[PDB]
Design a protein around this ligand. Structure first.
Ligand SMILES: [Zn+2]
Ligand SMILES: [Zn+2]
Ligand SMILES: [Zn+2]
Ligand SMILES: [Zn+2]
Ligand SMILES: [Zn+2]
Ligand SMILES: [Zn+2]
Ligand SMILES: [Zn+2]
Ligand SMILES: [Zn+2]
Length: 184
């Protein structure tokens, strides 16, 4: 359902003038971490497809890359009415996040991506002070899945993080629906 501008942008190619602000509501819903899907072998067909289409890396090497990438103990994330809550160890934290703009990044490959920045200003909240969404979308559209970076140092410290990117899909998807979306 993507305009070809959207299409190329999801592949990391776009001009800075086409990036646009996004509200937190683009991420409304209940989301499952995909790390447990990795840890149970259910994402293995993704890693094997990528391994078979690339001469430089083996299945195990791709699997280890995404094991590092997806690792997190935030199992679920719920987003609604301006509030993000993070599920961890049978407890949640939550905050009403304020939008703080976006940041356009150029990866070492030459591909580009956009991070959408939010900040918690609730002295009562125990949620992360800074979060960043990144989901291969650069202008308003309901997200299909997202990477999130979370931290309590600064937004810049998050901008530096390129190895760990907890990734989330809608709760209702089965592991096979997740695998199918990932192979596209
Ligand atoms: Zn620019
Ligand atoms: Zn090797
Ligand atoms: Zn709730
Ligand atoms: Zn509502
Ligand atoms: Zn919970
Ligand atoms: Zn991605
Ligand atoms: Zn790190
Ligand atoms: Zn996708």
């Amino acid at each position: 359902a993507l305009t070809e501008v959207e299409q190329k942008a999801a592949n990391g190619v776009f001009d800075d003038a086409n990036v646009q602000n996004r509200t937190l509501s683009d991420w409304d819903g209940v989301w499952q971490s995909v790390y447990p899907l990795l840890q149970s072998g259910k994402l293995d067909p993704v890693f094997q497809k990528k391994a078979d289409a690339d001469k430089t890396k083996t299945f195990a090497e791709i699997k280890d890359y995404y094991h590092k990438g997806y690792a997190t103990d935030i199992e679920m994330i719920g987003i609604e009415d301006g509030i993000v809550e993070f599920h961890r160890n049978n407890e949640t934290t939550s905050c009403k996040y304020d939008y703080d703009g976006y940041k356009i990044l150029t990866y070492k490959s030459g591909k580009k991506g956009v991070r959408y920045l939010f900040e918690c200003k609730d002295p009562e909240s125990k949620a992360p002070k800074y979060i960043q969404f990144s989901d291969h979308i650069i202008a308003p559209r309901k997200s299909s899945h997202f990477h999130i970076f979370m931290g309590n140092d600064s937004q810049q410290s998050l901008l530096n993080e390129m190895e760990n990117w907890p990734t989330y899909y809608p709760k209702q998807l089965s592991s096979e629906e997740v695998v199918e979306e990932m192979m596209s």
